[PDB]
Each structure stands twice: as C-alpha cells, then as structure tokens.
Amino acid sequence: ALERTLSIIKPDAVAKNVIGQIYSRFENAGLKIVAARMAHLSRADAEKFYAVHAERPFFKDLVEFMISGPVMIQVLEGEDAILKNRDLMGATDPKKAEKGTIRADFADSIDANAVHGSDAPETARVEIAFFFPEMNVYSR
Ligand SMILES: [Cl-]
Numbered sequence: 001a002l003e004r005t006l007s008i009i010k011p012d013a014v015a016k017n018v019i020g021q022i023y024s025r026f027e028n029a030g031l032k033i034v035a036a037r038m039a040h041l042s043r044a045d046a047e048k049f050y051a052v053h054a055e056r057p058f059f060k061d062l063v064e065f066m067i068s069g070p071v072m073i074q075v076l077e078g079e080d081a082i083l084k085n086r087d088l089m090g091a092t093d094p095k096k097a098e099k100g101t102i103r104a105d106f107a108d109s110i111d112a113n114a115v116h117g118s119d120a121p122e123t124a125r126v127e128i129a130f131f132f133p134e135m136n137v138y139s140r
Helices: 011-015 019-028 043-049 059-066 081-089 102-106 121-131
Strands: 002-009 032-039 071-079 115-117
Touching: 002 019, 002 081, 002 121, 011 019, 011 059, 011 071, 019 032, 019 071, 019 081, 019 102, 032 121, 043 059, 043 121, 071 081, 071 121, 081 102, 081 115, 081 121, 102 115
Parallel strands: none
Antiparallel strands: 002 071, 002 115, 032 071
C-alpha cells in the first residue's frame, strides 16, 4: 500500500538552499525519495504541467514563479504518500498555513510557496510520468 506522489521544491526554496531541510521532512515522515532530478523548466513545460489551471486568474504568475530558476523534482514513496506530503507542505497560502509545515517555514507568499505536491492519485500518476520515465523511478 505504498503510493507515490510528485514533489517539486520551487525556485524560491532552491534559491534559499534548504533542499536538505525539506528532504529531511519527507524522510522523517517515512517517505522515501525514489526518483529525483534538478531541472530548469521551460515556460512550455510549466504550462503543460499547470494546464488544469490555464483559463484561471493565477495562471500567468504560477508559470513564471515556476520557471524563474532551477527546481528540485522528486518522487516520494510511502504509505499515504500523497496526503502525508500535503500535511508536511501545509496550506497553499503561507499566512493560513499551520506551524511546522514546509510552507509556514519557507514560503514567502502565495506565489513563492516553496513546494508542490500532487493532489490525488490520478494527478500523481500523470505528474510522475511527466517528469520521470519509470526506468528512473526506483521503488525500494
Ligand atoms: Cl521565457
């Protein structure tokens, strides 16, 4: 019963050099990094990634904050990986995010919000496949 979710450490949190602290929150919550790479998404990639929000007001900002610098992309595996990741991340608005979460601690605003996590099983499957061939996802 170990599912997988896609996580991105966004360019604001990479720029702060806290990849390690965030990673440790995943690992101490019993999640395992089974795929990882550092990438700089093109605008096009960010758009396909965020397609589900295309005709939305916050789309422009969400793409441009995702492509402003390098990001750290990983597949996290474990029991209830998707929801555990979401608990660790906290609310999308840091202002309304609980103490001890990744966003409360590292997010500068709604746009510069430190991380992404997949929101359900179907989005997790599609996001993992977007960034990684299974050949490079190592279940352990
Ligand atoms: Cl551009």
